[PDB]
C-alpha cells in the first residue's frame, strides 16, 4: 500500500497518551536495540496511525485493543521523506478508544552529535572511556525511537535502559528499579514521566560522580566525569539559589524530586533543557574559584539560569509549533538576565544584556531580518528559528512589556499564564490573552504586540521639543538602497524645577503624536535605560541639548542611558541621519565617565570605524582617530591597575581599557604587559597571571618569534581551556603572516588545534591588517573542504564568511565576494548568511560615502 498521508504535519487523528521506552545500548559498538509501547487514543476516524521514525530496521510491529491481551500483526509503511511511518491498522479504530502500539527495532547510535549520539575519550589516567547521550531539539527525537515527533503531543514516558556495571544510567525521571541481570548487565527503570513534549525526552549513559543536596523537597545535583567533580561546586551552589528563586517567583514548584545538570565531557556537546536532565558542555560548567575569571563565572551563572528558567518556559508550558519558538527561548533569555539582576546583582549582567540588545538591533535593522513570529513550514526554516533574533528580540519585548506595565503586573500575567496552560501547548496570542486579564479591567489589549511579532525591524522614533510640547514621529529604521506602524511604549526623563527628576510614560500608536510636558525643560532624554526596543533620533537642537548636558553633569542619567545615547548617535551617523562629527562631539564628555557600560560601547563604535578605515588604506586617519578617543579616556586608562581587584563591572572596564591601549600602542600600556609576559614566560608559566590582563599580556608577548613560539608550547601542553582560548587569540594576533596561515591551515585538518577552533582563528586573523586579506583568501582557497567539515548552514559556516568579509568596504571587493559565491552555486549564493554578508559590505561602502570626507577635515 502507498502512503495514506501526504502532508508534512502529522494528522490530528491518532494521539499518544503514554510512552514506554526500553533500550539496550552498546556503547563500545555504536549500536543498540530498543522497544516502544505507545498507548495511543483515537479522536477521528482513520485506517492508519501516522507517526515519525527515521534510520531504523524494525523487527516486529504489533497491534492491540482494549481489554483483550492478544496481539495481531500489522504491516508497516515507511516514507522516510518527512520521516513518517504508518501502521496499516486492520480494525478501523474509533473516537474514544485507546489503543496500545508496540514497535521493536534496531539502529545505530550516532557518529555525529545529533539525536541519540555516542562518543569516546580518554581518562585522567589515560584510559579510553566511553559515553552516550541525546539531543532531540528540534526534530531529532524521531531518529532514536519511532513516535509522534511534534511538540504539541505531550504524554508520559517510562524509560528503561540496560547498561553495564561501572556506567551510570540517567534519564528525565529518577531511578527506582535497578535490577542486575546474570551477565553483569544491570538494568534500571525510571518513573513515568510527567506530561511533556517528545523533543524533551533525555537519557544518558556514562561513568559519573554525583554531588547533591535536596532543598524544599527537590534533589538538585551536578553529575559529571570523575576528575572534574571538584570544580562543580559553583554549579550546584548556583542551581539551588536559582531554583529557589524561580519556584518563588512563578509560584509554581519544580514538579520533580530531582534536578540533574550533567557536564558532558565533550567539546561538541549540545546544551539543552531536558526536564530533570539538564545538559551542558563540560567547559561551560567547571568554575574554579581560584584560577577562573569573570567571563568564566558570568557565563557559568548565565547558562544555568537560562537552562533552569527553561523548565518553566519551554517544558511545562511548551509552544504548539516552531513558529512560536521565540516564546520559550525569548522567555528563557529574559528570565536569564532577570534572575541574575535580582540574585546576582554583583555581576552587573544588565551590561551584558544591553550590549546584546545593541548587537541585535544592528542585525534586525538589516533586510535579511525575519520577524520572530514567522511562518515555518519546512525543517531548515525550523533550524533557522534558533537564531539571535528569537532569543534577544523576543527578550527585548518582554523587557519592554515589563517596564511598561508594572513589574508586579508583568509577574501576575506570567503566574496566570503559567497556571492556565501547564502541561499543555501554547500559541503567541495565548500569552497575550493572559496578559490582558488585568488592570483589572482590560484597560489595554495586546494587539499592541501584534506589530512587534508579525513584522521585522523596529521603529525610529523622531523627537522635537519646541517648548512645553514634545512632538513624536515614528518610522521604520531603514538602511538606504510602506506598511509598519508600531504600538510604542514611550518613556522619557528630564530635569525641571529644582532638578526635578521627572519621568513619564506614554504610547505613541500613530505616525505622529505629541507629549505634554509639565514645565519648561532644557533637556529631555526619550527611552529610559533603552527599555524600549527602538532608536530615538532627536532634532539638531535637542541632540546638542543633551550633549551640552553630558559635558556639564552626565550623571543625571543612568549608565544604560548614557550608553544608549552613544549607541544611537553612532548608528544614526552611520546611515547619514547625523554628521559623524556630532557622534564624536557627544563622547567628548567621556573624560568624566567612571561607568563601564557607556565606555565599552563607545570603545566598540570607534574601534569599528578604526578597523573599517584601516582595511582600506587610511592608516593615518585611523591612527589619529584612536588617539582622539585615547585622550578622552587617558586618565581612566592610566589610573587602571593590572590586578583582579574590583566589582565584576569594574574588572570589565579594566579589561576593556587595557586591551584597548595595548592594541594600537598607547602610553605605557604595552611594556607593562611586555614586562609581565617576560616574567610569566620566564617562570615556565608557573607565575599566576591576573585573568583580567591575561589576554592583553598574552597578545603583546605573541608579537615576538620567541614569545609566540613559547605560547604555542603552552597550548599543545597545559589543560586550562579558558586559558587555552586566551592563548590561541594571542597566537592569531601575530603580525607574521606566515604564522597566521600556518595556524589556519593547521587548525583545518586539526593538527595542533581542533577544527572547532578554526572559526575563531579565521575571524581573529582577519580583524587586523596583516591577516585581513589572508583570511578571506584562506576561505576561498579551501571553501570545498570548509563545506565538507561544516554543514552548509550551521552557525560555523556563517560565522566564518561574515567574520572574514564584514570589513570590506569597496565596490571592487563587493564584486569579488559576490562573484566567488556565484561561481559556486546559486543554491549557495542565495543562502541567508552569504546574501547578508553582501549587504554588510554594501552598507560599509555607504558608510564611507557618507562620512569619509567628513572625517578628513578634523585633526
Amino acid at each position: 500500500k502507498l502512503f495514506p498521508w501526504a502532508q508534512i504535519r502529522l494528522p490530528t487523528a491518532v494521539v499518544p497518551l503514554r510512552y514506554e521506552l526500553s533500550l539496550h545500548p552498546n556503547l563500545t559498538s555504536m549500536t543498540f536495540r530498543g522497544s516502544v509501547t505507545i498507548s495511543v487514543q483515537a479522536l477521528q476516524v482513520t485506517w492508519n496511525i501516522i507517526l515519525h521514525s527515521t534510520g531504523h530496521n524494525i523487527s516486529r510491529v504489533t497491534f492491540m485493543s482494549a481489554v483483550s491481551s492478544q496481539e495481531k500483526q500489522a504491516e508497516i509503511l515507511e516514507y522516510a521523506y518527512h520521516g513518517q511511518i504508518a501502521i496499516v491498522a486492520p480494525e478501523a479504530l474509533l473516537a474514544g478508544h485507546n489503543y496500545t502500539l508496540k514497535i521493536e527495532y534496531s539502529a545505530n547510535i550516532s557518529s555525529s552529535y545529533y539525536g541519540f549520539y555516542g562518543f569516546s575519550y580518554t581518562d585522567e589516567s589515560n584510559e579510553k572511556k566511553y559515553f552516550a547521550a541525546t539531543q532531540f531539539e528540534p526534530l531529532a527525537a524521531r531518529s532514536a525511537f519511532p513516535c509522534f515527533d511534534e511538540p504539541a503531543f505531550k504524554a508520559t514516558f517510562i524509560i528503561k535502559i540496560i547498561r553495564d556495571e561501572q556506567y551510570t544510567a540517567l534519564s528525565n525521571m529518577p531511578k527506582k528499579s535497578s535490577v542486575v541481570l546474570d551477565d553483569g548487565l544491570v538494568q534500571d527503570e525510571f518513573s513515568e514521566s510527567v506530561k511533556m513534549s517528545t523533543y524533551l525526552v533525555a537519557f544518558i549513559v556514562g561513568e559519573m560522580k554525583n554531588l547533591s543536596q535536596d532543598v524544599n523537597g527537590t534533589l538538585v545535583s551536578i553529575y559529571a566525569v570523575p576528575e572534574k567533580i571538584g570544580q562543580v561546586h559553583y554549579a550546584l551552589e548556583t542551581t539551588v539559589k536559582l531554583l529557589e528563586f524561580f519556584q518563588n517567583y512563578f509560584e509554581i514548584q519544580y514538579p520533580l524530586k530531582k534536578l540533574d545538570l550533567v557536564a558532558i565531557p565533550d567539546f561538541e556537546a549540545g546544551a539543552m533543557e531536558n526536564w530533570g536532565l539538564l545538559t551542558f558542555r563540560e567547559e561551560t560548567l567547571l568554575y574554579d574559584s581560584n584560577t577562573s575569571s569573570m567571563a568564566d563565572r558570568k557565563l557559568v551563572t548565565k547558562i544555568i539560569a537560562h537552562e533552569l528558567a527553561h523548565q518553566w518556559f519551554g517544558n511545562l508550558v511548551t509552544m504548539k509549533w516552531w513558529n512560536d519558538l521565540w516564546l520559550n527561548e525569548g522567555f528563557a533569555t529574559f528570565m536569564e538576565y532577570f534572575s541574575l539582576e535580582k540574585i546576582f546583582k554583583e555581576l552587573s549582567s544588565y551590561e551584558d544584556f544591553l550590549d546584546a540588545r545593541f548587537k541585535t538591533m544592528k542585525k534586525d535593522s538589516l533586510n535579511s531580518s525575519h520577524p520572530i513570529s514567522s511562518s515555518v513550514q519546512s525543517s531548515e526554516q525550523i533550524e533557522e528559528m534558533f537564531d539571535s533574533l528569537s532569543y534577544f528580540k523576543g527578550s527585548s519585548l518582554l523587557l519592554m512589556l515589563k517596564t511598561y506595565l508594572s513589574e508586579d503586573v508583568f509577574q501576575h500575567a506570567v503566574v496566570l499564564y503559567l497556571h492556565n496552560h501547564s502541561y499543555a501547548s501554547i500559541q503567541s496570542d495565548d500569552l497575550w490573552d493572559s496578559f490582558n486579564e488585568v488592570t483589572n479591567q482590560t484597560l489595554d489589549v495586546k494587539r499592541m504586540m501584534k506589530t512587534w511579532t508579525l513584522q521585522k525591524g523596529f521603529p525610529l522614533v523622531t523627537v522635537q521639543k519646541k517648548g512645553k510640547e514634545l512632538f513624536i514621529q515614528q518610522e521604520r529604521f531603514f538602511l538606504n538602497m510602506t506598511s509598519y506602524l508600531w504600538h510604542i511604549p514611550l518613556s522619557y526623563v528630564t530635569e525641571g524645577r529644582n532638578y526635578s527628576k521627572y519621568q513619564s510614560v506614554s504610547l505613541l500608536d500613530k505616525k505622529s503624536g505629541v507629549i505634554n510636558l509639565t514645565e519648561e525643560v532644557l533637556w529631555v532624554k526619550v527611552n529610559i535605560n533603552m527599555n524600549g526596543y527602538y532608536i530615538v533620533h532627536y532634532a539638531d537642537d535637542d541632540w546638542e541639548a543633551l550633549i551640552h548636558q553630558l559635558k556639564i553633569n552626565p550623571y543625571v542619567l543612568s549608565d544604560k542611558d548614557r550608553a544608549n545615547l552613544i549607541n544611537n548617535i553612532f548608528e544614526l551617523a552611520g546611515l547619514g541621519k547625523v554628521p559623524l562629527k556630532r557622534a564624536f562631539d557627544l563622547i567628548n564628555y567621556l573624560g568624566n565617565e567612571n561607568h563601564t557600560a557607556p565606555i565599552t560601547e563607545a570603545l566598540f563604535q570607534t574601534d569599528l570605524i578604526y578597523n573599517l578605515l584601516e582595511k582600506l588604506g587610511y592608516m593615518d586617519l585611523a591612527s589619529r582617530l584612536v588617539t582622539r578617543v585615547f585622550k578622552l579616556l587617558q586618565n581612566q586608562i592610566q589610573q587602571q591597575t593590572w590586578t583582579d581587584e574590583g566589582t565584576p563591572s569594574m574588572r570589565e572596564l579594566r579589561s576593556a581599557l587595557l586591551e584597548f591601549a595595548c592594541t594600537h600602542n598607547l602610553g605605557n600600556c604595552s611594556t607593562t604587559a611586555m614586562k609581565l609576559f617576560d616574567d610569566w614566560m620566564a617562570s615556565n608559566g608557573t607565575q599566576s597571571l591576573p585573568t583580567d590582563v591575561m589576554t592583553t599580556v598574552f597578545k603583546v608577548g605573541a608579537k615576538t618569534d620567541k614569545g609566540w613560539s613559547f605560547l604555542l608550547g603552552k597550548y599543545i601542553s597545559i589543560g586550562s581551556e579558558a586559558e587555552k582560548n586566551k592563548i590561541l587569540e594571542a597566537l592569531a594576533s601575530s603580525e607574521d603572516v606566515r604564522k597566521l596561515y600556518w595556524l589556519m591551515k593547521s587548525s583545518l585538518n586539526g593538527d595542533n588545534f581542533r577544527t572547532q577552533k578554526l572559526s575563531f582563528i579565521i575571524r581573529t586573523v582577519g580583524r587586523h591588517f596583516p591577516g585581513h586579506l589572508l583570511a578571506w583568501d584562506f576561505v576561498k582557497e579551501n571553501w570545498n573542504k570548509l563545506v565538507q567539515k561544516f554543514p552548509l548552514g550551521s552557525y560555523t559556516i556563517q560565522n566564518i564568511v561574515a567574520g572574514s568579509t564584514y570589513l570590506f568596504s569597496t565596490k571592487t571587493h563587493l564584486s569579488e565576494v559576490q562573484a566567488f559565491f556565484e561561481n559556486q552555486s546559486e543554491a549557495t549564493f542565495r543562502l541567508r548568511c552569504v546574501q547578508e554578508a553582501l549587504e554588510v559590505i554594501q552598507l560599509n561602502i555607504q558608510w564611507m560615502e557618507k562620512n569619509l570626507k567628513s572625517l578628513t577635515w578634523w585633526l
Binding site: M272, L299, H306, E329, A356, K359, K363, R763, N799
Partner: peptide, 9 residues
C-alpha cells in the same frame, strides 16, 4: 542554548 562567541548573531 546557542553559545560560542559573539552573542550578537
Amino acid at each position: 542554548x546557542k553559545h560560542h562567541a559573539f552573542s550578537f548573531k
